[PDB]
Amino acid sequence: SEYDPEAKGRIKHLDVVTLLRRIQPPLGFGKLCPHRVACKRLVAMNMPLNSDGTVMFNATLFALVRTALKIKTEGNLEQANEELRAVIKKIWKKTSMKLL
């Protein structure tokens, strides 16, 4: 919410790197150079295929939460939402974009 005077849902991609830099190592990244770790790890996870500068807030932290615990590789992305739809409460159609 720091970069948004009003929420409006989405921000531009230029502030994505600065968003992850100011986070603690227990949640963000290490104290070394972000280019060697943070920049390379940014593409490693799964992201929605939206426009150049249209990313929603819930599509950013969800990847971080998925990275913190039970990290999974490619090939079983739909298994993640399958686990949520079988244990977690009702999704209320809000995980459609986050599914991919």
């Binding site: 919410s1 005077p5 969800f62």
Partner: protein, 96 residues
């Protein structure tokens, strides 16, 4: 015995207790508004209002009010009572 009753949440087919509380908060959230102002002439004062030195200065300003509010005692001197009235005006003025 109460705690053992709360153990029956057997949704741990793949997730642990740590994942139980973090996931639900993520699924139900909405960003708030920072209310950053505009119109520079109005924005000029926003720097003074929203700044670390300003709130730090008022942090000890409130503390000194508490020290003043605790110094009243039984049968205090007339000069002490007079010194308290002006100190009350000074603090209420700056808070106003």
């Amino acid at each position: 015995t109460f705690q053992e009753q709360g153990e029956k949440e057997y949704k741990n087919c793949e997730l642990d207790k740590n994942q139980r509380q973090c996931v639900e908060y993520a699924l139900k959230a909405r960003p708030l508004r920072r209310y950053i102002p505009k119109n520079p002439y109005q924005y000029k004062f926003w720097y003074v209002v929203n700044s670390s030195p300003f709130e730090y200065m008022m942090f000890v300003l409130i503390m000194l009010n508490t020290l003043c509010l605790a110094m009243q005692h039984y049968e205090q001197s007339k000069m002490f009572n007079d010194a308290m009235d002006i100190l009350n005006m000074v603090f209420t003025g700056v808070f106003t």
